[PDB]
Design a protein around this ligand. Structure first.
Ligand SMILES: [Zn+2]
Ligand SMILES: [Zn+2]
Ligand SMILES: [Zn+2]
Ligand SMILES: [Zn+2]
Ligand SMILES: [Zn+2]
Ligand SMILES: [Zn+2]
Lengths: 138, 138, 138, 138, 138, 138
């Protein structure tokens, strides 16, 4: 039997957003979201850690080739999200509140489509150094 | 079914302490604890990461409102622990050795009383950048 | 029943290496490993986090004594790995590709021999701030 | 703290149903469900194991008073399900195919409604001695 | 490495007991325990499944030699428990209510005493075919 | 998303074998295997529970079409194993001791070959009503 390990790669992207549910009154929104509801928005340098799991290849010594993982992350996170306004430049958030929880879910779905079956293990998103969301496909 | 995610918030506090079990001889104490047994104490800037888990709300997009989580952490960690001497200013450590393991347990119990049933998932305490304790209620 | 917690200690070491499987052609190697295949090698300041788990002792307040853990890590990581060339100075990598996955496995085995039965929980190795491998004995 | 254990109670109920999807043509239903699509139905003596988890109470030695668990199951399982025709007698299955999987889900939901938050651990349904479904709220 | 599997052995024993707490008045005991509080006791043919886990030995193909497992269970279960009156014949239950939960705990403890560190995985006790308790050392 | 559940199907097969290691002397084999080493063999009516896990399909209400699961098991279990002498009739056991543990492993492997990636969850093999092995791919 081959050994199994978890391989993680961290990436960063800068983006803008405003927390606001159109399904709530301007009064409720301001109450639920407060400062994050700033009409003109605000932004963050997000840090994303993507974890893959599998067998360590017996000849190559890798769970997955870093170049492949890099490329998957470029297409699934960097391309659609870097230097964008989440609520305005990405179709997905047209109906979904751009909380870090939903950013983590979005990234998970993107990667699921690109990655081999069962490779994805966890997506961790730091909206700030103190605000972190971990999504494991639950 | 709603999706479930883990929401973490990091906080910091400075405190003082001395590791010493009155249930041991001054000779044993010095042997078990060594430098941490310094009679006049020493101190640390502790970093605490508190993780909550639950469903991502369908309208709000949050596992829990950050303001509520912030407030819970203020009452359960900051208030009793920040700028205090653990063994002298907090009743709990009058009988318990103030190791990081017990600091993690203390914080867990405090939060359990304040948080909704089943929300708390993990308490991580960095006594130093190199010394970490994770308590999951086990 | 005693409470159980996870105790982690982080250590660092600098080492050199080159990724190259003798079981592949010079052409394949360069293709699989690319830059990491540099004939004269390259190097990293590796960060290793070792996690132990067990009961918090009722009198001492510790899952494990830090001095013992420190010493185990000195013998199992620092001694054989610090300021060494992985592929040339450590027997283990004479047949194994020195990927971070195999470095994590090596460290795990070393520690398993030194530690009490069932204490070891996880070995996390940062080859870089962005490249991390977690091995849990799977 | 207090030790935690799992308490299971087995219950059995008699019911009939017909596997049929209104989104599939008469021909697809036969092909997908075969004999289970028999127009007039068929039936089973379903066996259901409900597992609860919690701390063993220090004075009574119980995770849950069996009398309470029995009442819970009379309500969540026996009353709506026993000696009924699933597809016609229980509104839930009006728009849901009555597979063993959906019976398990239905039961899980009825139980979460009555039981203390966090108590329910698993629902196991034996449609026959050979076909079993386990639902754990995933 | 070597594959890991779980080995279970089922054993059965006959015993009597009475559910009664000396911390509850005669009236509370009746109310809490009902028929199980019958002054002269009642009994069960208890069925116990003991699960061990470990690596499949490469030469013998065994996780544990069944002969060793049988002896372990004769000692931990059959000798102290078979054909006994729980509350009167086993000192452990002198101060502990003999619920199925406590029988499982007792058995788990007796086994941890004899078995190799880390081997014991689960203890399942059927008091009746309908009342089951699973203890996993939590 | 879609709910996830586990589907199990039980199958039974008749077979004979002899526990014997060619790496052990005639005397060690008797000592290690006892009665199971009987030169002419012995046999069992093996019972096998195969557990699959996945999402409950939104239209059919199935985790897997039972017809597909039956065919899978006819192929992976019944055909190579039923009414056979394990050590002599199945090449796999030519060099592997036919313990229940190895039967479980063998079955797990045959199933992983046929089943969709990620579907197989557990293999449980009852050699007798008292000796059970569970393999989960570890
Ligand atoms: Zn924001
Ligand atoms: Zn200190
Ligand atoms: Zn490198
Ligand atoms: Zn049916
Ligand atoms: Zn009883
Ligand atoms: Zn046999």
């Amino acid at each position: 039997l081959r050994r199994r390990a978890r391989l993680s790669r961290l990436v960063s992207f800068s983006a803008s957003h405003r927390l606001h549910s159109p399904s709530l009154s301007a009064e409720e929104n301001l109450k639920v979201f407060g400062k994050c509801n700033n009409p003109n928005g605000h932004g963050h340098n997000y840090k994303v850690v993507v974890t893959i799991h599998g067998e360590i290849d017996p000849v190559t010594g890798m769970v997955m080739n870093l170049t492949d993982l890099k490329e998957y992350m470029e297409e699934a996170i960097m391309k659609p999200l870097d230097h964008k306004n989440l609520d305005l430049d990405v179709p997905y958030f047209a109906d979904v509140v751009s909380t870090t929880e939903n950013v983590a879910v979005y990234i998970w779905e993107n990667l699921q489509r690109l990655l081999p079956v069962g490779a994805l293990y966890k997506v961790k998103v730091y909206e700030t150094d103190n605000n972190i969301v971990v999504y494991k496909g639950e």
